[PDB]
């Protein structure tokens, strides 16, 4: 019953795509049918939900937003290693309401096309076109002709100095929507409290107790960060560092801290700062110099991370970071931490149930704003 | 000219100074690396009188507060530079849709395990109770970590859908159309002026422009990869390049990304993913399609690097990176229709620039 029906426009290389289909079939036994029906982008929303639509549709990204609005497309979830194989801006094109809803294939935009016999070296600027046209008109030619009837062609110029269709409103933390009190949080906290109730952990275990027990070889596992590594290195323990365990088949989501270099808005040296950071520091040699002095852990620069991640501990830090959440960069985090500290302690000890501790934390977090 | 850099005393500040010294050797500009106590508290105190360091190093989360006070300069790296760092690290230094710092390093909790006690650690939290029973029979325990601090316990709590504050995704704002602002008027006025001064004709359309270029009557045109084959058939030896700037800013062509979507109702979603990821989005897969009918520039970096040996493709990609992604919402239909009318009417004598854009603003909205 497994098969793939693929829709692509008749002006694309659908025979080429079929050849890829045939390779798939040869490897998997699964038959791939490539079709190019007329009006396929109109037909798709008509048939897709009924159980007679294609499995895969190829079209320009802009139409997929409308499809996504109707819930016609499956959220895709490629691994980080796969996402990194495509240009970031192409993933931006297939994002809707913060979800990836397609795979990017190809990229098209307008360019400046010029006659090399008439103009061996074309102009850099729009402003130089009037004079260039005067010069060419003296030989009975013109500088520039393009389609003025269709805004697609004239928009690039119009947009240049601040024209736009729709303002993209940036993503934002919503401080009135706290998630300490939902089903997911209750499940995780209940598992934790149950580990305590069942005597697999003690409620009063803290940083030092855990560190000592691990470094003295009394416990098989601990949860900690790169700051703890050197203390373990000096111990007798042969340790590894790995991805955190899943809970209900989902990754554990540690908060991620990103050591960042900000440029003072009042600095008269902003161009120097940019030059230093981009071209001296954020290079393999620059990060190496810093790392050698005191380890950075995992780094944001791909080329150097690929070198550092030969150490599995660094690889694991990065893997956990990619599965985690970026620490929110807002003042209200203080209220969250305080409320949550209390909730876990009270649940861990039996002073409150899980539901009442999280309920109280939800109300405290919001009220402390 | 100089650079004073602040970084915490627990970081590799001597290493950073060595980088500073290399900068000085090349530029003649001295870099001073300092690690004052409480530097993250000091910065908003002295930056806000305007006498602080030029560069400050700290964890990204503190920079949100700084950015709220306008203490940090918006950074604008080129596309080629942004691509050198992991996307998610740029997300960490974004505030109100602006990049406010450069990401350096990445820190997170991991599972640390004793290889002599446990050569292969558990993949699941659920398997820990049984593992602990087994280890307790030898006088050991499975797992000990800091239960007092939510930083350490949150990973588990978050796993099944706990979160601090809902991040509401970025979104096109349909009540905010920008066809009628100073920038749009500037661009359109320059265009109308090209017409008024007889450097272009109001009536020029796709076919007229294509014919004139392909017959060697005009030095330049603006067009996409779809037009190339018709030029190839002409006598004209052509090049393809980056669009001209206007007021020293890039022309921003709309970018179309040919995309493959998976039907939400499909019972074959895992097959689709396998086909797309591991057969199609590879060099050999894209080559098969490309050989049949050219794709132009491609999203797959490894194959784009091969295709971009053709300067025309390189130029398409360069323009695409400087352009704007075509908004993926239905309301674009209203924008195009309104704007089509505005440009035609301004280009002709039929309306002024201001009145044509004003009418288009009102037509787009609704």
Residue numbers in the entry:
A (entry chain B): 5 to 373
B (entry chain A): 6 to 371
Provide excerpts from the study.
To understand the molecular basis for the observed dimerization, we crystallized the protein fractions corresponding to the dimeric species of MBPeng-KFLFAK and of MBPeng-KFLPYK2. Both fusion proteins crystallized under several conditions. Those of MBPeng-KFLFAK belonged to space group P1 and diffracted to a maximum resolution of 2.0 Å. During model rebuilding and refinement, it became apparent that adjacent MBP molecules formed the same intricately interlaced arm-exchange dimers in both MBPeng-KFLFAK and MBPeng-KFLPYK2 crystals, (harbouring two and three dimers per ASU, respectively). Instead of a tight β-turn at residues 173–176, the protein chains adopted an extended β-strand structure, crossing straight into the second MBP structure for both MBPeng-FAKKFL and MBPeng-KFLPYK2. This β-strand pairing is stabilized by six intermolecular backbone hydrogen bonds between residues 171 and 178 of both chains. Because MBP’s polypeptide chain goes back and forth between its N-terminal and C-terminal lobes, this chain crossing resulted in highly intertwined dimers, where the two domains of both MBP molecules are constituted by both polypeptide chains. This structural architecture produced an extremely high contact surface between both chains (~11,300 Å2), corresponding to a calculated solvation free energy gain (∆iG) of −174.5 kcal/mol. Following structural refinement, clear electron density was only found for the Asn-Ala linker and the first (in the KFLPYK2 crystal) or the first five (KFLFAK) passenger protein residues. The Tm of MBPeng-KFLFAK monomer (60.1 ± 0.43 °C) and dimer (59.0 ± 0.49 °C) were lower than MBPeng alone, demonstrating that these particular passenger sequences further destabilized the fusion protein.
